[PDB]
């Protein structure tokens, strides 16, 4: 299924702060009824966290550093199905602008796919973006059947 990440913690762990991490710490805490863990360790941004190892966690948190370092293992392996799914809805994406797309919509793969097909669509004539979305949906997101419609009624 799909973890609830917090919103403010929705973005990727790689550019997560040092608010960002405690504030995970907080939440899984709560969610996953770990033991209560101190957060003046990992003291550190999320490029930091990601370079822990289990036996890292584990030495901040001898009670829950094992399930912390599996919840972000879940996390990232999370992510990655997000941008594949986003590579395989909009060909020639790169990695980089599907992780960048993900972002702009809080982690919603539909949405983060939608908005890289109206961009595309949107430069192909003066109209809005209502409208650009408008035409999308209804060819169903099919950018080619809405790129044709755009072509012929510019
Ligand atoms: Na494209």
Same mark, same amino acid.
Do not use: F, N
């Given at each position: 299924?799909?973890?609830?990440?917090?919103?403010?913690?929705?973005?990727?762990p790689i550019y997560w702060s040092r608010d960002d991490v405690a504030q995970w710490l907080k939440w899984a805490e709560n969610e996953f009824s770990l033991s209560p863990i101190d957060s003046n360790t990992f003291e550190m941004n999320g490029k930091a966290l990601l370079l822990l190892?289990?036996?890292?966690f584990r030495y901040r948190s001898p009670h829950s550093g094992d399930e912390l370092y599996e919840l972000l293992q879940h996390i990232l392996k999370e992510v990655q199905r997000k941008i594949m799914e986003v590579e395989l809805s909009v060909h @020639?994406?790169?990695?980089?602008? *599907?992780?960048?797309?993900?972002?702009?919509? @809080?982690?919603?793969?539909?949405? *983060?796919?939608?908005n890289l097909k109206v961009d595309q669509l949107f430069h192909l004539s003066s109209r809005s973006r209502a409208d650009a979305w408008r035409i999308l949906e209804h060819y169903q997101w099919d950018l080619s059947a809405a790129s044709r419609y755009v072509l012929a009624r510019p």
């Open positions: 299924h799909s973890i609830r990440l917090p919103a403010h913690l929705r973005l990727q190892t289990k036996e890292d @020639g994406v790169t990695h980089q602008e *599907a992780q960048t797309a993900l972002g702009a919509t @809080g982690g919603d793969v539909v949405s *983060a796919i939608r």
